[PDB]
Amino acid sequence: RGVNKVILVGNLGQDPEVRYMAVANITLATSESEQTEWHRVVLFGKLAEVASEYLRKGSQVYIEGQLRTRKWTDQSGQDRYTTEVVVNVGGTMQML
Amino acid sequence: RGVNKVILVGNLGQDPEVRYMAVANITLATSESEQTEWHRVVLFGKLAEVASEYLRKGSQVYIEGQLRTRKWTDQSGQDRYTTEVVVNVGGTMQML
Amino acid sequence: RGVNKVILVGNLGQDPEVRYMAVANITLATSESEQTEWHRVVLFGKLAEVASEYLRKGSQVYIEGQLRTRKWTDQSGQDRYTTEVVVNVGGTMQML
Amino acid sequence: RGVNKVILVGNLGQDPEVRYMAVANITLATSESEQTEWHRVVLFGKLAEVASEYLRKGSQVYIEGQLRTRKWTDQSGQDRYTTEVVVNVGGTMQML
DSSP, X not given: OOEEXXXXXXXXXXXOOOOOOOOEXXXXXXXXXXXXXXXXXXXXXXXXXXXHHHOOTTOEEEEEEEEEEXXXXXXXXXXXXXXXXXXXXXXXXXXX | OOEEEEEEEEEESSOOOOOOOOOEEEEEEEOOOXXXXXXXXXXXXXXXXHHHHHOXXXXXXXXXXXXXXXXXXXXXXXXXXXXXXXXXXXOEEEEO | OOEEEEEEEEEESSOOOOOOOOOEEEXXXXXXXXXXEEEEEEEOHHHHHHHHHHOOTTOEEEXXXXXXXXXXXXXXXXXXXXXXXXXXXXXXXXXX | OOEEEEEEEEEESSOOOOOOOOOEEEEEEEOXXXXXXXXXXXXXXXXXXXXXXXXXXXXXXXXXXXXXXXXXXXXXXXXXXXXEEEESSSOEEEEO
């Protein structure tokens, strides 16, 4: 079964892209120092409502989730893959 | 500065692709249940020597590292990106 | 080897969505009578330049191509598929 | 009125799924070389009886029909669409 766990603590790059099917899309940024990196976090369930409700750009946050990489072939007929951090169950989100 | 941390516990899909510059390349697989997923782990430094030395396909392992996504444009002149889990400093590898 | 051939004669629904990588995207409409249907035509190669150059919404056209259905999993983690008519080699496009 | 025509020559993937309301369901496969593709052919009317009668898996066939894409919303309340090749009138089926 193994374990797939990702922990990230960083600030948003832009206000949440919540879209009620709900599902929020956020791009967390986690530096060093700075090879500042960016992260594509997908907050499923209710946890999304909250993001919209009071998260909002600049906001520092804590996230626990799992790694999800989905492959999606494009027009030119080529296979491309996107890697993201999903917050379904288990994971969590926490304003700081 | 934020935090970028990834924890994974799974089994290899194929023996290590170590290449002394060293650097080992391993594809960890971490299921659920099973949407079994696969992971592209890059073990830098000395930690690579060990992988080659005694890791080897099927081997169950523990890994702590950071998320690295590098973009690389191709012949057709298009921008593609690859997401991996690097084991430089901080991270670790542990036979189980 | 079999044969996969599609012939369509209809009018565009909206001016071409050419995007130089080139590749044009057009939605041909082919009625009866009227269960008017719509088609997602993808004009690869040079044939795209022309589309942009002088095709343009309302324009009646002739197209010969092949059937291409690509599957692409989404955020909710579900597999979805899109069916289109590609104009690579063989196929053709012809202003009428 | 436009024209919507599809011509395919390939072999079945599995014996016909005829269901007398009749209507047969067949998944034709048409390669290149091989990006082997598969097709969802729906043989309406009498043409279905024949399919059941003597078509049967592996059988190479010729088909002329029209493109039909129907949209059907699912439990999660999302809109999904399925694209198929219908053999009502006009089209034809021919053992080879």
